[PDB]
DNA sequence: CCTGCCAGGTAAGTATCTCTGCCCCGACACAGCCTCATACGCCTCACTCTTTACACACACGG
DNA sequence: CCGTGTGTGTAAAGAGTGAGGCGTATGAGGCTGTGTCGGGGCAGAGGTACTTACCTGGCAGGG
């Protein structure tokens, strides 16, 4: 008993069950339905030396279908399901193979023909224009873009520069989240300007030369 | 800078377009390819033409598709 | 316990880029005049389907 | 034969969006100036067929 454990009772019962193949009209007229109860009825005439299966649609689901049955001996073929509470059974073994086939000899082919045009429906295709299109680069100004990065970098305005005191104790308290920090991120965490920045970290923060990647400067003073 | 020239260029042909058409066409706004502008002609030492409504009919009504008699029209009436 | 020439296979050789600091800048405020151009905003107007009211009418049925 | 139970007109609200003009605000332009700061180049480390020649494996002797 455990969650990778697969069910076999349905093995151990030696159940039966049938593969058949089926149109797309005979499946999407059952999904139609809806799963009302009842779809049709399937026949099956046994002489005495042959045998006939054939299945018959639902007259209120249409507002035959014989069956052609396989050699099974090409395969083993079972069922398993899994439960939507993660419990994987078996549901058995394959003892027969069918498929479905139309009466419709050459009529069925006019709802082929529909049906190869409803796949072919959403196949765009490039449209011929009766006239040059003059909606595009429509003069202007200034482009949308620039308005609103002109107006979010006014509205932010210039970065102002602080006393040396205060740029030092929040300096410091960087350093203490990450032990190397690059010039252009600490600008982000200091919020102030590029030189007033440089100068300031120049006095008691040094460059250390990294091959890796490049030189950086080091927060701590010695 | 070739925005502007772009701009020049077009008056001295003859076929002007407007700071707005340049500007449409290039990532530059309309006031700095005009400001651009002054400066290439001061630097260069030359001049361009004024422009007149009769440089735009052609283009303008044809964009809007106006019949040849409407373009005249319209060429007339600016004139 | 080493050492080497020849056949076969292979192989040439020719012919027909990503950051990175960094000085030398534009664009901010803001002053009056000024003309025309561009944008916003707000209330008044329209209208249109969909009910909303209300006097009146009219079977209806036994 | 007079009760009552359902219909109907038609502009009147009721929202339900939608539209349009106008008036105020904004801008752009040189101008001139002054602090500043992102910025933007700026170069810079730093990471098709035939023939001939050459090399390798093998078996052979030699010492």
Redesign the pocket.
């Given at each position: 008993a455990e969650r990778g454990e697969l069910d076999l009772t349905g093995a151990k019962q030696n159940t039966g069950v049938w593969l058949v193949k089926v149109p797309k009209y005979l499946s999407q007229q059952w999904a139609k339905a809806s799963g009302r109860g009842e779809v049709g009825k399937l026949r099956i005439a046994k002489t005495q030396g042959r045998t006939e299966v054939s299945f018959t649609l639902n007259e209120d689901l249409a507002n035959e279908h014989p069956f052609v049955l396989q050699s099974v001996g090409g395969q083993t073929l079972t069922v398993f399901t899994e439960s939507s509470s993660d419990k994987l059974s078996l549901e058995g073994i394959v003892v027969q193979r069918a498929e479905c086939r139309p009466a419709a000899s050459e009529n069925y082919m006019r709802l082929k023909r529909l049906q190869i045009e409803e796949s072919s429906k959403p196949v765009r295709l490039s449209q011929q224009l009766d006239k040059v299109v003059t909606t595009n680069y429509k003069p202007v100004?200034n482009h949308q873009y620039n308005i609103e990065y002109?107006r979010k970098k006014?509205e932010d305005g210039?970065?102002?520069?602080a006393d040396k005191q205060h740029v030092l104790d929040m300096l410091f308290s960087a350093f203490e989240k990450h032990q190397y920090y690059?010039?252009?991120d600490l600008?982000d965490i200091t919020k102030?300007?590029?030189?007033?920045l440089?100068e300031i970290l120049k006095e008691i923060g040094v460059q250390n030369?990294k091959?890796?990647?490049?030189?950086?400067w080091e927060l701590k003073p010695e | 800078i070739a925005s502007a020239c772009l701009y020049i260029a077009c008056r001295q042909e003859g076929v002007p377009r407007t700071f707005?058409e340049i500007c449409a066409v290039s990532r530059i706004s309309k006031?700095?390819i005009?400001?651009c502008f002054?400066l290439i002609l001061k630097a260069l030492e030359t001049s361009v033409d004024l422009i007149t409504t009769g440089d735009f009919m052609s283009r303008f009504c044809s964009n809007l598709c106006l019949p040849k008699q409407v373009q005249m029209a319209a060429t007339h009436i600016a004139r």
């Open positions: 100004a002109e006014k210039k970065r102002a520069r690059n010039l252009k600008v102030q300007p590029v030189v007033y440089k030369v091959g890796i990647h490049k030189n950086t | 707005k006031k700095e005009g400001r002054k």
